[PDB]
Amino acid sequence: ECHNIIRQEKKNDMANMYVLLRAVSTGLPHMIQELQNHIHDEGLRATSNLTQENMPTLFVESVLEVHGKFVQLINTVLNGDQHFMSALDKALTSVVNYREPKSVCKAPELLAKYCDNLLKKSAKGMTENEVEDRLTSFITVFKYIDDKDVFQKFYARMLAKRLIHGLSMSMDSEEAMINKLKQACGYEFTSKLHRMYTDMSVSADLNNKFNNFIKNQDTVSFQIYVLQAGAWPLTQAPPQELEKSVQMFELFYSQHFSGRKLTWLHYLCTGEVKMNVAMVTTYQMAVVSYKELQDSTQMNEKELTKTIKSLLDVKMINESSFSLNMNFTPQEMEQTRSAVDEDRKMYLQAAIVRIMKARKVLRHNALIQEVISQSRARFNPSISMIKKCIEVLIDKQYIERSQASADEYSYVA
Amino acid sequence: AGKKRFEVKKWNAVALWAWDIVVDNCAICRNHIMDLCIECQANQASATSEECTVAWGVCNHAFHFHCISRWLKTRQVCPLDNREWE
Ligand SMILES: [Zn+2]
Ligand SMILES: [Zn+2]
Numbered sequence: 133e134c135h136n137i138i139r140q141e142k143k144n145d146m147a148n149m150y151v152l153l154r155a156v157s158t159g160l161p162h163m164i165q166e167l168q169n170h171i172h173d174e175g176l177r178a179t180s181n182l183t184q185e186n187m188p189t190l191f192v193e194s195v196l197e198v199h200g201k202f203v204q205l206i207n208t209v210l211n212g213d214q215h216f217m218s219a220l221d222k223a224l225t226s227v228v229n230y231r232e233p234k235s236v237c238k239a240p241e242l243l244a245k246y247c248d249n250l251l252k253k254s255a256k257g258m259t260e261n262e263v264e265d266r267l268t269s270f271i272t273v274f275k276y277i278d279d280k281d282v283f284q285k286f287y288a289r290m291l292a293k294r295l296i297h298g299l300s301m302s303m304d305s306e307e308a309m310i311n312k313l314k315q316a317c318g319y320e321f322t323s324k325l326h327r328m329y330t331d332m333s334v335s336a337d338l339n340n341k342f343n344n345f346i347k348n349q350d351t352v353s354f355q356i357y358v359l360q361a362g363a364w365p366l367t368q369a370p371p372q373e374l375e376k377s378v379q380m381f382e383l384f385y386s387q388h389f390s391g392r393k394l395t396w397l398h399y400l401c402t403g404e405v406k407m408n409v410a411m412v413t414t415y416q417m418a419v420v421s422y423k424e425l426q427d428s429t430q431m432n433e434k435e436l437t438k439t440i441k442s443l444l445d446v447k448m449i450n451e452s453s454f455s456l457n458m459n460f461t462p463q464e465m466e467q468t469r470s471a472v473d474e475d476r477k478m479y480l481q482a483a484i485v486r487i488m489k490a491r492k493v494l495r496h497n498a499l500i501q502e503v504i505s506q507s508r509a510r511f512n513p514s515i516s517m518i519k520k521c522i523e524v525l526i527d528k529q530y531i532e533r534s535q536a537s538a539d540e541y542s543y544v545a
Numbered sequence: 546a547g548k549k550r551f552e553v554k555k556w557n558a559v560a561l562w563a564w565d566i567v568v569d570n571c572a573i574c575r576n577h578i579m580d581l582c583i584e585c586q587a588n589q590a591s592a593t594s595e596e597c598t599v600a601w602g603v604c605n606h607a608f609h610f611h612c613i614s615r616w617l618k619t620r621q622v623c624p625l626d627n628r629e630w631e
Binding site: 355360363402407419458 | 556577586
């Protein structure tokens with residue numbers, strides 16, 4: 133009757149069953165197992181109910197609905213207990229990383245989008261001072277992610293864009309998110325996101341020195357964000373300035389930090405509104421066909437043509453004639469999988485070096501379920517990827533082989 | 546006054562910064578100079594990942610100190626240029 137009773141919400145039979153199964157040694161583990169199966173069934177049903185809709189808020193709310201129902205059930209009729217809670221966590225961990233017949237797992241994308249929708253100043257599906265509770269609840273699903281690596285990278289890109297373009301609602305709220313992600317997934321693992329966040333704040337404070345620098349002398353002020361390149365995913369998109377004395381900023385930063393290299397991301401800079409949305413905030417060419425504005429000074433023409441197209445088709449320029457206006461990411465994530473591949477190869481190189489220092493000779497049959505134990509904190513790799521590591525490290529002078537009648541991988545140092 | 550001014554105004558510049566390499570996964574170690582090398586990453590060392598032990602040559606390009614030391618103990622050439630090491 134355990135199977136029949138744990139799948140029933142009502143009445144005394146559950147209650148006294150839990151008492152008598154606390155008594156028997158074989159009782160509580162069977163209850164735990166049946167409840168784990170029940171939780172996996174319910175969670176899979178709840179997640180799979182959203183076919184072709186795939187709304188991130190409703191996805192997270194489905195997982196949290198199952199979690200809330202089972203927590204309430206456990207406290208109401210079983211007991212608040214580590215074993216039932218662990219069964220819930222394990223089952224939902226198994227659930228969240230999807231296995232649909234015609235689509236690879238989309239959960240880390242939806243979870244990154246949930247965080248961005250929380251933090252956006254638009255705040256369409258979520259609202260400030262409720263976002264705190266929402267992102268507290270998000271930790272429940274955050275612990276359940278298998279490829280925390282993929283979720284972290286996907287959130288990192290949209291974090292970068294939101295903070296650079298000022299789309300985030302509150303800088304403090306972004307820090308609160310990053311702290312919650314750090315305690316959920318690891319401070320060391322989320323450190324790069326923390327550095328990316330820190331760049332805007334520290335550079336904003338450093339602009340208090342840059343303004344004094346600009347006023348110190350003439351003939352060589354504006355805000356700067358200087359970005360720590362090893363963490364940031366954004367690039368220059370290989371662009372005229374609104375204020376246009378950027379070499380003063382370069383001189384200031386170099387003199388302040390004698391030991392740092394730097395380059396300018398003109399594609400991402402922004403200005404200020406209005407002439408006398410009121411949008412003039414990007415790519416102040418100052419001048420006619422849009423293509424003729426490629427007559428700039430010496431500059432990367434790739435970026436130039438991109439900015440020309442952007443300027444032509446937003447708001448401001450109202451081929452035979454032109455005039456000015458009278459008044460006023462799934463493909464990218466799929467692309468980011470490439471950077472994920474590079475990062476995973478680096479990570480597996482480190483992990484394989486640790487494994488090789490632990491045991492100096494091995495074979496791939498033993499390497500299976502050891503690399504998973506050494507990588508599951510971030511991701512759950514494939515055997516082809518593990519072999520992609522090993523069969524290059526043999527020629528990197530990391531691994532060596534001499535055996536003929538059997539497998540081998542011998543550490544090199 | 547006209548609508549075509551594009552006046553000089555308040556502006557928000559953006560830039561990257563790094564330690565002094567054209568990095569492209571610098572050949573002594575398949576890592577960024579702003580991140581731990583393979584040995585320190587495998588060990589998960591307590592050193593600052595952003596600045597593990599950065600050092601500069603006489604040519605003023607940067608290297609990981611551990612990696613250049615290990616390279617120096619076997620070959621007499623600069624790792625990034627293959628000229629005489631200095
Ligand atoms: Zn390197
Ligand atoms: Zn050199």
